Amino acid sequence: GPVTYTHDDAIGVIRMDDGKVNVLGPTMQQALNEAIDAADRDNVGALVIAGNHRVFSGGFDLKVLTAKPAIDMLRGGFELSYRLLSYPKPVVIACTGHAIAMGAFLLCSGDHRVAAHAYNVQANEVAIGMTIPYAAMEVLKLRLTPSAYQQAAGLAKTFFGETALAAGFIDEISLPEVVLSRAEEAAREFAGLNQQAHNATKLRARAEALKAIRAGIDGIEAEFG
Template sequence: MSRNLLEACVDGALVTYRLDGPVATITMDDGKANALSPRMLAELDAALDRAAADGAVVLLTGREGIFSAGFDLKVLAAGGTAMRDLVAAGFTLAERVLGFPAPVVAACGGHAMAMAAFLLACADHRIGARGPYKIATNEVAIGITMPRAAVEICAQRLTPAFRERALVLAEVFPPEEAVAAGFLDRVVDAAELEKTARETALALAGLDRAAHAATKRRVRGPALAALRAAIEADRAELTPAP
């Protein structure tokens, strides 16, 4: 295997990491709905560690037909510290993506629900596949009060006209309308998604990395501070009483 093409994939892994030139492709694939379980989140975080060490632009993607269905519902249903830690880990990962020092491109090849939609929103450039797919923050529809961290992400990344429709009304958006809402930047035919995402990542690799990182900190610093405070407030609220 050439020095500029590396792949990390162990048996049973939920996330694969592939470095090809200046682009690190991080792929979620649990063979099902790409549920954001504790293990999936840990593997995503480790993959971002590798991308940072490699100085790579990140291309984050999922399986054909689904980016991710969001948090693992079994862990959410269990409640207690397991639920608290899962929610904190998910939004901490989103915070990391929002502030990642290199450009992050997301290729959404299908559905992105709940926490997955928030994670998608945090990428620098989001490309969706055209098709009968749903992008939604459906917490209210399934009886969950929207986390403060989710509100902060949407305050920064969604367009004002769609923000309350997404958060308060749990509206479901097809890919084209998700562009207007702010979850995506553009939509392409599914057959072109991988090629378009890689071309976009390669173009962004040409940015001056130091200037990009410093400008991102300057532009998003207040948002990242507000998001961190919201994560801690959510954690405190979800901590079981002794």
């Protein structure tokens, strides 16, 4: 399958690799959800989500998006963001290559985000004639600076490295060969925080956003129906 789950002492590691660009279609979404179910079963201290050697994720499966299967894929994508944003343990994203559209929203759904200098991060929807869904806007608004939010969304601006960090698309820049190892190291460090206080505090930090993402998930049919 397109997802590999490993349980490594204090952490769970989930690696996406569909042999292509890790599109978040129904197959990948199911595989991710099952992997997180496995982490839940193991009661991991922290969880790493990684891409493959060429990308984090290129986004949704656009063949599907281009009514019901498209709606289900959209809902499932944003439900995954919600699941990771409300995860009771720290979540670290190993952004192992570019993160585009739903890949960028997924990247913005973890607590700590590690990327290499060259990796592009872009909500390219407007450049290809798609309006950004309300749930995705809320995910962006939660992390981007006010001015980077405007440009990322309305102008499909591409960020990388220092601009991605300043914008709020990522939290740490690492050399490409250590993005995954550094994400795993960070996750081990974060598993040392008090879990109860971490979860209580992250939810306070995200209360309005999580409500609005839920509303955005509920309203998908009223946009792509």
